[PDB]
Design a protein around this motif. Structure first.
Motif, PDB file in Angstrom:
ATOM      1  N   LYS A   1       0.624  -1.149  -0.039  1.00 38.78           N
ATOM      2  CA  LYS A   1       0.097   0.071   0.081  1.00 38.78           C
ATOM      3  C   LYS A   1       0.768   1.217  -0.134  1.00 38.78           C
ATOM      4  O   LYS A   1       0.630   2.231  -0.588  1.00 38.78           O
ATOM      5  CB  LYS A   1      -0.934   0.064   1.162  1.00 38.78           C
TER       6      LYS A   1
ATOM      7  N   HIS B   1      -6.538   0.640  -6.399  1.00 39.71           N
ATOM      8  CA  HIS B   1      -6.881  -0.410  -5.434  1.00 39.71           C
ATOM      9  C   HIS B   1      -8.047  -1.437  -6.144  1.00 39.71           C
ATOM     10  O   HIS B   1      -9.072  -1.337  -5.847  1.00 39.71           O
ATOM     11  CB  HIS B   1      -7.830   0.047  -4.220  1.00 39.71           C
TER      12      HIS B   1
ATOM     13  N   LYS C   1     -12.923  -7.985  -3.424  1.00 36.69           N
ATOM     14  CA  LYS C   1     -12.200  -8.074  -4.613  1.00 36.69           C
ATOM     15  C   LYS C   1     -11.613  -9.391  -4.697  1.00 36.69           C
ATOM     16  O   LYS C   1     -11.597 -10.001  -5.829  1.00 36.69           O
ATOM     17  CB  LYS C   1     -11.149  -6.961  -4.506  1.00 36.69           C
TER      18      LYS C   1
ATOM     19  N   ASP D   1      -5.682  -7.154  -5.893  1.00 37.50           N
ATOM     20  CA  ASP D   1      -5.666  -5.931  -5.062  1.00 37.50           C
ATOM     21  C   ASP D   1      -5.250  -4.533  -5.387  1.00 37.50           C
ATOM     22  O   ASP D   1      -5.811  -3.539  -5.282  1.00 37.50           O
ATOM     23  CB  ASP D   1      -4.792  -6.167  -3.611  1.00 37.50           C
TER      24      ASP D   1
HETATM   25 MN   LIG Z   1      -6.709  -3.978  -0.557  1.00 30.69          MN
END
Ligand SMILES: [Mn+2]
Ligand SMILES: Nc1nc2c(ncn2[C@@H]2O[C@H](COP(=O)(O)OP(=O)(O)OP(=O)(O)O)[C@@H](O)[C@H]2O)c(=O)[nH]1
Ligand SMILES: O=C(O)C(=O)CS(=O)(=O)O
Ligand SMILES: [Mn+2]
Ligand SMILES: [Mn+2]
Ligand code: NA
Length: 612
Positions: A241, A261, A287, A308
């Motif tokens: 991230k 994302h 997801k 992701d």
């Molecule tokens: Mn995620």
């Protein structure tokens, strides 16, 4: 040197500082000088290194081997350090407005700026001497296939062997990356658990962390990520991230691409035609279930590129080419079952690290929603290392517990998942948890409308419906107003083939709280409709919110009990409220940086609802 304190060669236990590119050496040695590690290990990414580090963690009580599976491992953390922690995640820029819009009335929910001065003080109160008595591991890694024009390289320094192991899975790491890098640019990633030896505070569960001083900082203008005090997930595996959303979204803005994302999947129909789709849902909104879907419709096939993060760039032909910059799946374990994600179940039984799940007495894994009985006699140890019974009040696994598994093992991994040129995206899907009001699927009317739909995303967290634009609320690397403008600008790129934009809702409920749609593999029926719409099929009916499926357009064969009328219902009353809430949000939170076109889409939607 006039003495012997600046050259760290004598402390190198794998590799050579002399072998490194000049700027990588400077990064390593400067931070060795600061953090004072006992040793420096330059990672080579080899199986030997990996095997031996796992065995070392095992020796130390840091991980346990899961004897039921092939080379699988379990880490249980300090309960204070169980999740990515947004409240201690910051971005540093000269001007606050470059990081978040200045809100009209409220506090920004779109980021968390910290000044350079405040960060320098925080850094100086944390990092000096923080690795004393520990090994500094140097992790050279590629986000993206090695050699892809879309890939970027990072170097992560860490004092956590758990981070090394997990980064080998989730990125492409080791000596080939150093060789690929040479004297090029790279993202500087610094991580410490914040527990120099001798320990000043008790170690809980053999899990080094410093919750009181936890801080995950991003310095995009310096191409640096600096993370202290958490050993967990998004806080410590800095490629994911920190780099591939926060830093990369800023790079993307600068360079003309997108960092999102989003899962990326390939779907093939019964006529042997394949399209790639990307989808942006928040955490807890599925997801990973979609990315790895086992479709229920005969003759349809789904393959996984990533689950992701997507990096996407229009090529010279106008195709939106996407790569998955990750090398594995860092998936939520609880709720993963043969019925909700059978392909994950296959993937995670070898070479996989689990964190904060329960352990069965035969050396297997367990969690809430595994939906899989144990033989009589088999008992369970919870993620808190205590005996646990199904009838107990506490869950056996932490709700954010994770598996960390290689992508190459996924039985439906797409044949182009490491193609350096990326895959051509033909549709982008938005979605969240909406128990009321929002239909199963609708299609945006234009690119501008679709960017508005992304912007307007909301999702259930007493229930609270919060805003999570583009599924990026925790992750914007810069001012969200400017991100909107960046997405809008894609329409003005010569030759761009702009993908169709859809919004989904898997989570609409009836008056009794029951899901109206069965979901999971049945979502293939929604994908079929999207597929046809991309091909130009006359399967859509216009409504105030966008296009929905015509009556009888969805394949509902094998369902039959589905209440399509409630599932696709659009209430004027609900949508009046909805538009007001979006208006108030965008006005406060995006304020002077709200692009004209998004304000226009807001007005247009209010106007269409007004004519109901
Ligand atoms: Mn995620
Ligand atoms: N009702 C319903 N629930 C779903 C569906 N797909 C996924 N879920 C739920 O979504 C949750 C799992 O999603 P997560 O793995 O947490 O979502 P994610 O988007 O991959 O999250 P991150 O990995 O944190 O980015 C579970 O609660 C599932 O039951 C669906 O089609 N229908
Ligand atoms: O929170 C998410 O959307 C994640 O994928 C998990 S972590 O990488 O942020 O820990
Ligand atoms: Mn996931
Ligand atoms: Mn325009
Ligand atoms: Na532990």
């Amino acid at each position: 040197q006039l003495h012997n304190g600046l050259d760290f060669s004598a402390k190198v236990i794998q590799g050579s500082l002399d072998s490194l590119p000049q700027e990588v050496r400077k990064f390593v040695e400067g931070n060795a000088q600061l953090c004072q590690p006992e040793y420096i290990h330059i990672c080579d990414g080899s199986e030997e290194e990996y095997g031996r580090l796992l065995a070392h963690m095992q020796e130390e009580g840091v991980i346990r081997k899961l004897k039921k599976y092939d080379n699988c491992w379990l880490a249980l953390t300090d309960p204070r350090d169980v999740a990515r922690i947004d409240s201690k995640t910051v971005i540093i820029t000269q001007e606050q407005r470059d990081t978040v819009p200045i809100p009209k009335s409220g506090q920004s929910q779109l980021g968390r700026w910290m000044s350079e001065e405040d960060f320098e003080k925080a850094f100086n109160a944390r990092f000096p001497g923080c690795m004393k008595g520990r090994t500094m591991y140097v992790i050279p890694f590629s986000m993206g296939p090695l050699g892809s024009p879309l890939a970027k390289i990072g170097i992560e320094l860490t004092d956590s062997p758990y981070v090394v192991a997990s980064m080998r899975i989730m990125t492409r790491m080791g000596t080939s990356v150093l060789e690929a890098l040479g004297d090029g640019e790279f993202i500087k990633c610094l991580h410490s658990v914040g527990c120099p030896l001798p320990l000043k505070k008790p170690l809980v569960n053999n899990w080094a962390c410093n919750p009181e001083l936890t801080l995950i900082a991003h310095l995009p203008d310096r191409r640096e990520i600096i993370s202290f005090g958490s050993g967990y997930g998004g806080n410590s595996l800095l490629g994911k991230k920190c780099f591939a959303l926060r830093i990369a979204s800023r790079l993307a803005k600068e360079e003309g691409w997108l960092a999102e994302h989003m899962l990326i999947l390939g779907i093939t129909n019964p006529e042997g035609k394949k399209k790639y789709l990307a989808a942006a849902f928040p955490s807890a909104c599925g997801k990973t279930n979609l990315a790895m879907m086992n479709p229920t419709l005969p003759g349809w096939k789904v393959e996984c590129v990533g689950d992701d993060i997507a990096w996407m760039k229009f090529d010279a032909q106008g195709n939106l080419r996407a790569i998955n910059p990750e090398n594995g799946f860092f998936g939520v374990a609880p709720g993963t079952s043969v019925k909700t994600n059978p392909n994950a179940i296959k993937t995670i039984q070898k070479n996989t690290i689990f964190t904060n799940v329960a352990e069965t007495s035969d050396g297997g894994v367990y969690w809430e929603g595994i939906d899989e009985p144990l033989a009589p006699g088999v008992t369970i140890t919870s993620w808190k290392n205590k005996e646990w019974r199904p009838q107990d009040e506490e869950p056996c696994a932490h709700p954010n517990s994770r598996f960390c598994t290689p992508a190459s093992q996924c039985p439906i991994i797409d044949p182009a998942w490491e193609s350096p040129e990326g895959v051509p995206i033909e549709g982008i899907i938005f979605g969240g948890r909406r128990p009321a009001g929002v239909p199963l699927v609708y299609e945006a009317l234009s690119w501008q409308h679709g960017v508005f739909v992304g912007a307007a995303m909301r999702s259930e967290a007493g229930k609270v419906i919060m805003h999570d634009p583009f599924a990026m609320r925790p992750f914007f690397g810069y001012n969200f107003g400017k991100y909107l403008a960046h997405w809008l600008s894609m329409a003005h790129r010569p030759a761009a083939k702009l993908p169709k934009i859809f919004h989904v809702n898997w989570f609409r409920k009836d008056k009794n709280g029951k899901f109206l749609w069965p979901g999971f593999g049945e979502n293939s029926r929604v994908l079929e409709w999207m597929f046809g719409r991309i091909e130009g099929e006359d399967s859509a009916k216009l409504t105030p919110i966008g296009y929905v499926p015509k009556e009888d357009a969805l394949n509902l064969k094998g369902l039959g009990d589905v209440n399509v009328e409630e599932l696709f219902g659009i209430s004027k009353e609900f949508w009046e409220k909805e538009v007001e809430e979006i208006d108030k949000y965008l006005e406060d939170q995006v304020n002077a940086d709200l692009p004209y076109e998004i304000e226009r889409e807001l007005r247009a939607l209010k106007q269409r609802i007004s004519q109901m």
